[model samples]
Target: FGSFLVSLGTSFVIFVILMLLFTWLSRKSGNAPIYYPNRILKGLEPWEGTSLTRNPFAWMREALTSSEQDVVNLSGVDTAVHFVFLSTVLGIFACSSLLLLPTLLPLSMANITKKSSRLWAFLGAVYWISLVTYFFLWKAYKHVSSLRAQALMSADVKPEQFAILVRDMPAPPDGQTQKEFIDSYFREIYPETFYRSLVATENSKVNKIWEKLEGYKKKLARLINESVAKLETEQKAVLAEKQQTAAVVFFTTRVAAASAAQSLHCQMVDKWTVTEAPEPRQLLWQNLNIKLFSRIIRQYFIYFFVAVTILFYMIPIAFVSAITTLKNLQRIIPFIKPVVEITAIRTVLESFLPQIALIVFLAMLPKLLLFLSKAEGIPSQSHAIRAASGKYFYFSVFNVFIGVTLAGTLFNTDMIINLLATSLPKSATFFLTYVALKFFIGYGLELSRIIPLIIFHLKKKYLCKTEAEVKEAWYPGDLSYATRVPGDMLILTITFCYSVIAPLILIFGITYFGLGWLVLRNQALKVYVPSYESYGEMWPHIHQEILAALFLFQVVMFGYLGAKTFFYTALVIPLIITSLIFGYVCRQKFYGGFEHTALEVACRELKQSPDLEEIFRAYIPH
Candidate 1:
């Protein structure tokens, strides 16, 4: 019980530290650029005087004279403000779990129950629930928020008179020469998009985001209207101008914007958003749906898990309480003592059997999840799994909805295993850890190879690199890496099979050497791998989540083993060593030396373009 308390409390404390660290890091790292036009617009009040006085146009001559060009003029650190914002945001999660929740109760149940105290037991249960609740929901919210952000940034290109970017790219240039035209267009558009994206996510860059999106929309609109007016009134002259090397303006003329509200509306409709997404409020509204769904799924999974957990806890609760109570009862009526003891033992054992059964089964659930993932088609297995699960799995918000509803359901799945710590016999507890270890290390290390390949390709892609090296770098069409590593998944699959069987062997061999099981667990727990999905756009968030979940599992396992071993805890020193090795391997492999966290990457990329760097600096810290 004390181990459980330390498990949840220390975890909450560490999570808060992580939150503070991330916020501190985000602010410390940097922000996106806010162009001259952006600052002018952001600083502008809604009054007539603001546009007249503060606008960049007012000092256009002086601005040009200063020789500051493009992004260089705009990038500057707003470090203090950036720190405050990031710190404030992190404070929400830190305070929620560490401070406010503890006021609820400790994560572990301390004393014996039944007649000794129900009130305190209830309080302990409530505290455990709070920690799980806050951690789960926070993870889900962040996952969804990132997806929404990506979708919006993509829409910013080619301001749509409508919101979504329809497949309707203005028809290709007039002739085959259009290949070069397309090339040039993409070359320019890509760098601009890259620059913008880096700066947008940077610290202190939020103001720049609003400034560019709104102000640029207005400017592009004015230009489009003027071009349209000229084309309508002076068609021949406009044609002559277009033919005579107006290749760049040729497309710019069509780049008109409606309103951010309209653009946001169209995007919402495209995404099938149910709520009316306001222009300035689009990110907020988008995150809200994501946040709401997160809360709902979290509640669903958590409550269901809670129902099972409460029942399981009841086993220990009832057994311990009834034994104590019956002893007390016997004092009142000594003659009936045998009858009371016999009946109490029977009742407690029956109640306890189901939990013990579940403990055995849960040890195998991961293997089942893996097998089911591959072997069972949804509908066919659905009925069988559902039937077996019976009414307990009933309160599920559609599993598909749960999948969509939150991001860290994987993390939630880990919560179910914590029950094992509570139920499994101490001697066997340290032994059965192999399966979790194998899954995490085997999968985590195997998947880690993805980063360098992705980075190499992205960096060298179609843009020249060392000839032999570039050719070896696998691109989208290539299967070199996959073919080379085709056995990776198969090996993992076999490891999964071995894991499922390991528990059975432990049960049978318990008399011989359950201690052998403990040694195997120690060996498996030391395994670690580099993580890279957090490096790039498609998978950073997902990868980050998986990494975090795996890390926590290792942490929990270490604590579990140490506690069960109690005074022999020195025996569990290997567990801590394992975690350090794992952490070191990951940090050294992916985030060490020249390798950068996404934040550092964003800053570096933005800095390469001075115009972007300046605008970003104004908003971000570094």
Candidate 2:
């Protein structure tokens, strides 16, 4: 307990210091790029025409006062959707904490006897929390769905809305070129709406030439302009003859494109397969040309690799959890005995070292999962990110949540069910410290932009020689939804599972999302710039995960009650059933809106009569 206090206090001190530094540094004129990348891109100077630039409290005030529409305008709908998810979940936990803390805290604290009425209170609290969670989850799902539909209706016309990616195109006759074949084929199917097609091509040679030309241009500047132009001409010539078996077909209206994408266009099921095109910036050009069979095979291979990776990751995580205490360290390595015997070193080692070790060990896997998702022939950045988010969620649940809770006893199946109820509450302290460290150190670093600030200055000093180079150095990239969503889901899972067993965790849970809401909102407004917008597609993934968390919470409580020899363990069974039913109902009602824009909305927007030809041609890849 002393060690825990020391760890918490130390983290609190660090958080305060970092926030002070963030306030001081963010106001500096030269740090504007690092602090306000999105605002800079939007052509709004940070604190322009206001004395708030010098005020330390200005950022917090702005972050707090900014409305949902402000977020949507600044960041995009997807970011606004993320903030909604955070705020909604924050509210759910806050409300649940209010109910659970007063009821469950005292019950759990007073229940020293094995057979008692406290188990009934536990069951009641679980039921109430589950119902409350379901209610909020439903509301949030509906809210985000409507938010997405509204955004779709109000958004400016985009090329992807009128485009469909047709893969597995049947080979053209010997007489006709690929472009000629695609244009004629689509024109015949829908004469009035068919506008144009851009055939996908094998561009390796062109890319090679282009890269060489770019390198020469960067080094030689104007001296190589003629050579660069000559090479680009050659590159274009090579590109024309290297067509692949896919094409992005553009239509005159969003409704027409949606109809074509959703309906079958060819006699053979595999040929001329059509789907709505991803945003141009989201396209993975290399994967676009992969055949369906090849994609299926690569996807299976990636699944197998991910399974192996998840299993293999448990080794290090188990090892780290095993040695969390100095006693365990002394047992493992006698050389550390002398060093860790001191109380000061021991407190830090016991409380801080294991959480950091777990964090570091887990950090290496997100990028690996993302790479695997890309390698599996996913043809868009959004799809890859979603896939990686699922993979990382499962990895963290198995290795971090289950592995840390069970530790050495994970492989013992018979004892596992017996230990589940007892072991989970014991691991609460570890998670409390972990959560505190995450919010304190994790969010502090994020809000401060310390790492990016350092790297930008270092690059500017040593590498940047031009305006474009400096801009590249300070390019604040998009929010990594791949890792961020799963990380937050894991926290939610922890909170749900421990809300009853360790009611104190509810405080940390509230702090986690509360701080997250403010910090992430500020970043979304001023720091991160989205590379591609998927509207509110991320909400479905979040909704599903939250349901999964609730489901897990119910299952854990069932086991816990059963272990306690409670006769009414069957009560949790209904909560589980209703949660699954809720998930199904949400999927049926709202999932389609995310996958495709509604034809009704599309046709309504068509009344504006957008210029189809220029928009279609603008998105065609060179």
Candidate 3:
């Protein structure tokens, strides 16, 4: 208990100091780019054209009072959805904490003297939390769906709305080019809707030749002294034999493209596959020409690798957990016994060392998972990000949550079964400390931007040779949703599993989301710029993970009650079924609005009769 209090106090002090440093550093003129990357991109002056003031609370006022529409306009729909997710979770857990801390906390405490009265209260709390969670999740899904539709409607002139990617093309007839065949085939089927096609071609050989020509041009420019030398090189295109089996087809209207993308185009299921095109910047050009069979093989291999990695990762985490105890630490490292005997050192080490070690160990996994996801031949950046997010969620839940809970008793079946009831409550202190450290240290570092600031100055002083290079040095990159989403989901899983077992965890859960909401809101407004916009596509992933957390909570409660020798464990079965049903219903009703624009919305925008021919031409790559 003393160590726990010390850990919390230490984290709070670090959080306050980092926040103060951020407030001071962000006001400096030299560090403006590090703090306001998005504002620079939007061509707004410092602090959005407001006069500079020494008032420390000015930026906080703007971040707190900014409207949802302001977020949508600045960051994108996906960011707005992120905020909604945070707010929804914040509300759910805040309410749960309010109710459960009063009812269940006392019941559990009294059960120490009496035996079985807490069982009924536990069951009641589960029912209430489950129902409230489902209700809030449904409301959030509907709200985000409408927000997505409105964004699509307002951006009617976007080229992706009138484009579809087609692959698995059959060979062209003799004496006819692939481009001619595709254009002719589409025109024959839907003559009025078909506008153009950009058939992909093999460009590696041409790229090599262009590189050589560019090098020679630079060399020749340096050598010429008396007269300016003109080196003429023809701009070349790939030949007919070099054409690939894919194309981006453009249409006259959004309705035409959406319907065609959603429909089957060929009698043979493997031929002429069509799908909605991703935005131009989001397209993965190299993977566009991969065959269906190759993609299937790649996906299987990637999944196998992910499973092996998750299982193998338990080794280091188990080691960290083992050393968390003083006896185990002394047994493993005898030379450190003298140092750990000191009272101040022992308390800090016991409270904070294990969490820091576990965090450092897990930090190396997200990038590897993202690389594996891209290797699976996914055709867009957003799809790869979603895949990586799923992989990270499973890995963290298994290795961090389950691994740490069952660490010492994993090898004994009898002990494992017996430990299920008490281990969760005993381990609550570790998780409480972990959550406090995450928000205080994790969000403090994110809001401060210290790492980027240091790296930018280092590059500016040592490596930069041109103005463009210096500009690139200070350019803040996009938010990595792949890592951030899964991290939040892990916290949700922890909170859900323990909300009843130890009601105090609910307080930390509320603080996690509340701090995340404030920090991420500021990041979206000032610090980061999105690499690509998917129009709130991440909402489905968020919705599904929330349902998964609810499902996990119900199952854990069922096991916990049974372990406690309670007879009403069967009541949890119905809640599990309800969770599954809610997921299925939400997917059926709201998923289509996210996957593609509705024909009704598309046709309504067609009333304007916007010119799309030039837009289609601009989308074709050189």
Candidate 4:
């Protein structure tokens, strides 16, 4: 026990050192482009920028106060809600941990057999606590949804809000063009609110020219910044324009857009696909140009691609977990048996190597998911983020949660059924250890910004010969929601699963979110420039994740209860039924209100008129 305490102390000391070093380096560099170079452009100050002499104290103050103002300026409650949920969860769980850990933990530590009646008292209490957490999550969803409603109503009339992207409009009648067909159809169907439409066309030629022009323009800008003696030699670009098959039809009021978005389906199969449009700059022109049948085929194909990817990645991770013990490790790799015989070396292999392998695999997953999402013909950055995040969320739950449990048990016993029954609580200790290791190493790495720091400095030193090159090198980045939202939420999910089994892990979960709150808020203010605003559009996904986490928790506990062969376990069946049924029912009930504008809010500006031609020009794909 004394030895274990010493090990924990050493790890905590390393975590503290890494965090402080990260803060100091970020401050000393004048908030250079390591993680968030965009701060320089946004006029947001970094730790060093406030006062180089004051070190971190000054930077934290500025980051906290200034980020508040930045969030106010953006009025982006949707994005803000993502960070808000983390802090809220941390506070709730932290308080709960304080209340529950001391009593329940001691009871659990007594090693009460699962078959005993006293076990019901503990598992029963956990079930009740889960109810409170579920209520908390539900209340949060409603509050954030309300906030989003206000934002949508308050927002000025924009192309996306009052328009719908109509794909695969039926071929024009014998004499009329596609534009005429859509104009005539919508005006008839939506007589009161229909204003005008812009038909899309292919623009590959224009796009090629545009690419050439951009490349030359960047080179020229670089040369000018260098104060080149022979500037005339720099490449010049020609201006050109182009067309698409899809059309965006505008409405006179928000009421019409919201109603039409959900109601614009026609009887004709595979034609007249009217959906909410993304912002003008975000439209996937290639996707818009694809034939309707081809796009449909591609969409389903990508779904299969993602499903296979998630399951396939599980093989190596399971292998790593199975070989966690020295005997198992030696069996797999006989050539390394001599090294495994060394006690100190064996300790490192058993304790450290499995985590490293899992980390490496998980790290590469987000990028691959993002690439697959883009390939699926998603029409906007926001939609792609939504798709990729959902996939990654499932991947984390399956690969990390189920895979780890299965891996630990696979070799423990010959009977697979016994392994399932025994491994659940057995892996709890390993997972608890993993939780501590992750928070220390993960947060340390995050605070350090080592990857971004190295890359930024290398570029600045060897490659940034001009202002354009410097800007390109720094490229103050946006948050990778695909990876970030999925991964962070999964950690919380795991915490929920093990909170009852390993109450000690609650402290680590608190630290993870508490630190995350500060780091993410800082990035939001100074580093991340949002690619697009969904006005809290991602809330449904978040709510789903929380709900899914709860469902998993109940299922795992239910398994634990039953596997013990206790008759009292029969009580847990209803909780299992309730978990999933409630999610499906609540989503059906409340999701639509958040998804679409209310009629009262949507029709608020019905008294006003809108420009007809300007709306058409907005969707011309120019």
lDDT winner among the candidates? Answer: 2
* Runs off by more than 4 Å, candidate 4: 1-49, 52-56, 59-75, 102-110, 172-177, 187-195, 203-214, 222-245, 289-300, 316-360, 404-441, 444-454, 468-473, 605-622
- Two-way TM-score contest, 1 vs 2, winner: 2
Report the lDDT tens digits of candidate 3 across residue range 518-540. Answer: 86776567767778889999889
For all predictions, the C-alpha RMSD in Å is 25.7, 5.0, 5.8, 6.8
Q: Which has the better TM-score: candidate 2, or candidate 3?
A: 2
lDDT of 4: 0.63
- Which model, 2 or 3, shows the larger lDDT? 2
lDDT of each: 0.29, 0.71, 0.70, 0.63
- Report the alpha-carbon TM-score of model 3 versus the true structure: 0.82
TM-score of 1: 0.22
Number of the candidate with higher lDDT, 1 or 3: 3
The most accurate candidate by TM-score is 2
Ranking, lDDT, top scorer first: 2, 3, 4, 1
Assess candidate 2 and give its lDDT: 0.71
lDDT of 1 by residue, 286-307 (tens): 1122223444565466456645
After TM-score superposition, the amount by which residue 510's alpha carbon in candidate 2 deviates from its true location, in angstroms, is: 0.6
Worst 10 contiguous positions by lDDT, candidate 2? 404-413
List TM-score per model, in order: 0.22, 0.85, 0.82, 0.77
